[PDB]
Amino acid sequence: KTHVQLSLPVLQVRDVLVRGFGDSVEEVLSEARQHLKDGTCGLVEVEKGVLPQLEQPYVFIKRSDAAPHGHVMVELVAELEGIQYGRSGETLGVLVPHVGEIPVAYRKVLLRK
């Protein structure tokens, strides 16, 4: 399927144990996609002071369209030293590995895979 319905656990930035997916744009996009498939991916909502507490390169989920079955259609865009790899809509949050942190909420997304 070109799209997959996922429910992403929303984590508080201070709870996150593994603060990124790796060391290159290509690795973080690769790892983010694997974790999204394996149900081991969390979402951090971006506000003032969040991104400096996480590790670059960043992986964002961004709105790709204006929402089947409650699921917002999203795609992945990476960022490293202020350059983004991908073009998409508004940021829903930054992806991180999920290793058992308790979420505050769930974000229903339809991921372009």
Swiss-Prot record:
Domain CoV Nsp1 globular: 2-113
Location of this chain's protein in the cell: Host cytoplasm
Chain intervals for the UniProt region annotation (Disordered): 1-113
Impact after mutating K37R: In strain: Omicron/XBB.1.5, Omicron/EG.5.1
Protein task: Inhibits host translation by associating with the open head conformation of the 40S subunit. The C-terminus binds to and obstructs ribosomal mRNA entry tunnel. Thereby inhibits antiviral response triggered by innate immunity or interferons. The nsp1-40S ribosome complex further induces an endonucleolytic cleavage near the 5'UTR of host mRNAs, targeting them for degradation. This inhibits the integrated stress response (ISR) in the infected cell by preventing EIF2S1/eIF2-alpha phosphorylation upstream of stress granule formation and depletes host G3BP1.
Name listed for the protein in its UniProt record: Host translation inhibitor nsp1
Lineage of producing organism: Viruses, Riboviria, Orthornavirae, Pisuviricota, Pisoniviricetes
